[PDB]
Ligand binder design. Sequence first.
Ligand code: NA
Ligand code: NA
Lengths: 386, 389
Amino acid sequence: QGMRVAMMTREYPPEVYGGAGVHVTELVAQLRKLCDVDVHCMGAPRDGAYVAHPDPTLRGANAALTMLSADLNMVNNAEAATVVHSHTWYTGLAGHLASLLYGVPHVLTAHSLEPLRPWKAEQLGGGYQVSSWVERTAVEAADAVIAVSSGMRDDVLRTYPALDPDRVHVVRNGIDTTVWYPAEPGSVLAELGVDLNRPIVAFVGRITRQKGVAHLVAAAHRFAPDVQLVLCAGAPDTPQIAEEVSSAVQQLAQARTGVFWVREMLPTHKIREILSAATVFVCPSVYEPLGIVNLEAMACATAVVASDVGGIPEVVADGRTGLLVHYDANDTEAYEARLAEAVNSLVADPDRAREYGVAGRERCIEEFSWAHIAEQTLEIYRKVSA
Amino acid sequence: QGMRVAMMTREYPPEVYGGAGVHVTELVAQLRKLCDVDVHCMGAPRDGAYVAHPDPTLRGANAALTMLSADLNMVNNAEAATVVHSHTWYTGLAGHLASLLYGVPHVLTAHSLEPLRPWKAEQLGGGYQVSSWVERTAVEAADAVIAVSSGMRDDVLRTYPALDPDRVHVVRNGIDTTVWYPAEPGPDESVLAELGVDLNRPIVAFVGRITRQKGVAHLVAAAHRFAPDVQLVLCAGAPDTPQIAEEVSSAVQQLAQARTGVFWVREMLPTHKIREILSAATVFVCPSVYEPLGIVNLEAMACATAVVASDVGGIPEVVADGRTGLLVHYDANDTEAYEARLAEAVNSLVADPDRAREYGVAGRERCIEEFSWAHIAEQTLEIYRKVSA
Ligand code: NA
Ligand code: NA
């Protein structure tokens, strides 16, 4: 006799480290203003969440098995729910079993897809066979799947073609415009030696194949000579790509002045400082179903140059908030030239860069509010509960 | 490396209460003469087995949830296996998850199917939604499914069309020929003495519960047409309804008034006494209207006794018509023909005691040649070899 959401996550404060943990935290804060939400999470005991622990009998067993034991405690804890909403494969089996045991609908947000993970050795172990089976099982049986972009929805339906496309919904990611906002320098830019009197082109992200950092470093050879490139590019996912980016950065620094590389992962206030100071933020991703960093740059009122892959064109409004650059994997020479041409056009026309940045924060406030996302998410809970 | 079978069960000695538990107990004993087997079971701690328990912290949750909790401990315990063999939905997810986690084949024996459970109010609960999902998951992904009869093979293929039929194998239940064997009355407490049965007149034996399914009322009806000196020994108790208690009680009293040799044993009997009665009988009658397996027929055959049985369910895979026994056709729309033909088959074996005796000997031969657990274990090991290739 009243809707009660069991929100199932692995990460929740004070143990949020990834995009999926940030998403659940912000979604729950807004959803609680509309309906009753119980947070089901894993890790350390805390007030205000139902913490699902693994079976202590399984101490030292394979991580996949200890994770399933925590899932069964999570199902046990969720007995009051009228709808269960799971996040990440770590809780997929919890939402699947709670749905079966209690007769309640299962809503699943697809943050990532096990079959699309870039191949690493760990994909040869039993753990990946278990995580792949959980995600297939959870996704194919879910009452609703939420994708944050039409791009991610396409990837979900391609990866799991038994899915009813009518059960897969686009509900965008939000951005908190009280955390991400145009901030004058307090200074990370001083500790780098960046000259605030010269244009700044910024990148923020991990060094992975998918994030296309090598394409931006190649493009930067063609920037006007007083332009500074500030690369916030850390935590490379392979030693090979660390060497490729390191080598490309050294070749760039040989050809031009104003190259800066922040190798360490930065907190929010330092990222906000750099995104705010930038005239252009570049997202050169070759695969970007999500593209959250584009919302962060837009909320900091900075013009964006980005590829047209995945979800990016649903966030970056070409000729209004930024400029899209066509990516074709068979013509990376053209991609690199066209990234540079887009950056160069905004650096040459600072009034246009400023207007695009201003429009970017307006789009965040207008179209990518968590309050609006919470309302659309509640509409999915209504459809599956009817 | 060498083959190491993780045999996954809920029931194992000393906590065996049903057919699936008996099956694993006997199969493991004979498989251990051929290959290394680890017993993975649930319930009370014991020597000689990996006993899987739930998470202590899940004490008091839905029974389906604590069963999945025990399954994860069973998967953890089974890490040395080269093949995992599951029995009942209770261990289906243990075999499925061990196959995924360790990269080993999963053999599943189908003793029953969740979607074919005759409706009870408990099929409205979430527990049944969980048991149904486990079984469909485990069966559709198994490297091999062992069906305990032809009918169970047909039900598996009908209920689970996504499983490749080439992966479904019939391997039947066996019989211990050292506990069921032809046995003389013996000088100490002969049960046939106590009851006042005549060793020198023909004995027709029935052993089962008083249920619609076991058809004792059809045998009582047929018994009116037995030749006059024929003794009916009914080992029939535990009526499952007052209605059939009243009906069968009334029918046996009516039979007792009409003819002499009617002996109605209601108390449950131990093996040594069941053996004595089956051994002494000229004919054992299994008049079941529903009988998936028909194992009681193997007890009579191992005691070297002719069988008269209905042709329902699995009975014709155990009783060889015209060789170890006689099958009687059952049509629910014509129970009067069934009762007359039951009598005609019994009367034919009573009228031809050499034939009754030849069928009994063929019955014991069939037990030793085809239904010994040594043969069942050899056929099972062959499925392990096929899936391990
Ligand atoms: Na800016
Ligand atoms: Na006999």
